[PDB]
Design a protein around this ligand. Structure first.
Ligand code: B12
Ligand code: B12
Ligand code: B12
Ligand SMILES: C[C@H]1O[C@@H](n2cnc3c(N)ncnc32)[C@H](O)[C@@H]1O
Ligand SMILES: C[C@H]1O[C@@H](n2cnc3c(N)ncnc32)[C@H](O)[C@@H]1O
Ligand SMILES: C[C@H]1O[C@@H](n2cnc3c(N)ncnc32)[C@H](O)[C@@H]1O
Ligand SMILES: [K+]
Ligand SMILES: [Mg+2]
Lengths: 150, 150, 150
């Protein structure tokens, strides 16, 4: 199926984008490098699950993401508005976020057709929420102000 | 519609790519950071216009882009040949340019189907002309020579 | 054809991604900058071949890539496992690799329909093998250890 190549090619692109963001993270010594690396491991499992009726993808990583999301959102100021995508790390993570959401769209037809576990798409969903939150968090910890267009 | 998610997801990806290029710009103190940021604001308006028979997208930003395009092209040497994509900022802008053109392709079916203002697609068109010109301009102002393959 | 715009737009995106990786390469003075630049030239020829029953694309660049691939793989430790995408240059090249594979997927329908030379798709195939190998090579020459998830 060409849909499988498109899906696994885009989770590959996502993992590679995160690889580059990871390099900028470790340069400025932020602690959450290891979280990004762990996500790369799970994205490898996602690639295995996409190319195989379907391979079960356990909900463990989703619940771990949700835990990290709560950890960071509870540290951030309230936000009820879109932001402009706040530093090199943060902007790189926003690009990873958009690539993640494109990866999620490529997985939808495989879930619809029943060929992959719906947890794959759930994980990519929450991953894009995590990247959004982590970018805000990196921007805050760098002292960069959130820019909101009106 | 999946076409709407694809279109707004790619203008999101474009804005995020520009966010990263913006970080490299402001590091080397180039003046046109604020232009890139303003484009991010308009891309937010484009996302609103894409997700809504259709929402009117005013031609103001298009005419402002055309003004900036003329300002920079009038400073550049003549060019009648393709260039190889000239410095970190310039190459980042060339990547933003290609992402912009992909965003334009995702908007075409929505314009064809009458679901979004054709000015959306016109804006993305001229935005890719602007990014091409701005990259040449950044490369020139850095003293990097335009590389032309024969 | 919209398929032609999608294909040439993605080889454009690939060349631009490589342009940025090239900037990181030349900063750290790695020797293989000129190889990346030569690939940009061939990608220009690929764009010409895609937009034109079809234009012959000579197999010269494919054989040159294969020569470079052998040169680098013969310097690398054995690998029988996926790696996590090893330094700024290496991670940038992994992102170029994933973009390259997306470009290859966009060329397939044009080759299938007989509209472009099948050598175009062969070149993009081997280009993604080359970028994978070059990224491993840059990571090795930087002393960064290959990270393998189990
Ligand atoms: C199309 C759309 C987008 C598009 C384009 C957005 C644009 N205009 O540029 C894209 C794909 C880019 C997108 C992005 C995201 N979106 Co959105 N999106 C929508 C949507 C469907 C319409 C937005 C719109 O254009 N409104 C019209 C404009 C003129 O309204 P506005 O004056 O800007 O008012 C908006 C904001 O105040 C927003 N809002 C309210 N509370 C919050 C909180 C947060 C954190 C944000 C970011 C926005 C937000 O609500 C209004 C939108 O109606 C809304 C849901 C809806 N309204 O039906 C969701 C919505 C705004 N999105 C939402 C979120 C979560 C996001 C993302 C963080 C997702 C992600 N992980 O990437 C990003 C944020 C991007 C950024 N830079 O801030 C949430 C925000 C509330 C929340 N936390 O649950 C909403 C409400 C959807 C939902 N989950 O119920 N989205
Ligand atoms: C397919 C195509 C592309 C493809 C692939 C190009 C490739 N080969 O790598 C892609 C999508 C990548 C592309 C990119 C762009 N393109 Co284009 N493209 C075309 C096209 C349709 C064919 C080009 C081709 O392959 N010719 C075959 C090769 C062998 O010819 P060549 O020896 O290289 O000669 C070319 C150049 O001299 C070119 N040319 C002449 N004057 C100028 C001026 C400029 C600034 C440039 C960049 C090129 C250019 O004209 C000849 C092409 O026939 C032409 C229109 C046509 N010819 O029918 C437009 C054309 C060359 N594109 C054009 C432009 C504007 C661009 C972009 C700047 C658009 C953008 N904003 O991104 C970029 C430039 C990319 C770069 N690195 O320089 C213009 C250039 C003239 C102008 N300023 O109006 C043309 C003429 C289309 C038009 N608008 O009328 N394009
Ligand atoms: C789906 C798939 C991918 C997907 C997703 C991979 C994932 N899971 O994240 C994507 C598109 C990302 C991909 C990437 C590539 N792939 Co792939 N892929 C496949 C495939 C079809 C299934 C892999 C899988 O999920 N196995 C299930 C998991 C649980 O198995 P595993 O325990 O990880 O065991 C695997 C590895 O040991 C792998 N392997 C064995 N020897 C080698 C050597 C190398 C260098 C690598 C990278 C892997 C590898 O083989 C097993 C896979 O069955 C296999 C072929 C097959 N098995 O049918 C090819 C395969 C593993 N891919 C291969 C290669 C070449 C690559 C790329 C280097 C291509 C490129 N130039 O980008 C990259 C490497 C990415 C990276 N970070 O290392 C080769 C590796 C052997 C070789 N050198 O010929 C294989 C065997 C296909 C082939 N050519 O015959 N691939
Ligand atoms: C925030 C808004 O973004 C849109 N949305 C939700 N998931 C995706 C995705 N994977 N890609 C693009 N757009 C998406 C919906 O419209 C949501 O409400
Ligand atoms: C410069 C050449 O690029 C092609 N072209 C025009 N608009 C796009 C786009 N959005 N994406 C990709 N290719 C495009 C046409 O062939 C044009 O002539
Ligand atoms: C390594 C694995 O990646 C898949 N594969 C091969 N070519 C592509 C491509 N252009 N894009 C995405 N996935 C691809 C096949 O499944 C191959 O076996
Ligand atoms: K795409
Ligand atoms: Mg950098």
């Amino acid at each position: 199926d060409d849909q499988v190549f498109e899906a696994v090619g885009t989770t590959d692109e996502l993992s590679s984008a995160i690889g580059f963001a990871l390099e900028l993270v470790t340069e400025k010594g932020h602690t959450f490098a290891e979280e990004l690396q762990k996500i790369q491991c799970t994205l490898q499992d996602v690639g295995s699950a996409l190319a195989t009726k379907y391979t079960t993808f356990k909900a463990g990583p989703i619940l771990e993401l949700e835990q990290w999301i709560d950890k960071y959102t509870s540290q951030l100021p309230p936000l009820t508005a879109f932001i402009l995508p706040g530093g090199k790390i943060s902007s790189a993570l926003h690009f990873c976020r958009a690539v993640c959401r494109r990866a999620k769209r490529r997985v939808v037809p495989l879930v619809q057709m029943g060929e992959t576990d719906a947890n794959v798409a759930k994980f990519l969903n929450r991953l894009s929420d995590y990247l959004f939150t982590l970018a805000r968090y990196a921007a805050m910890k760098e002292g960069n102000q959130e820019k909101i267009y009106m």
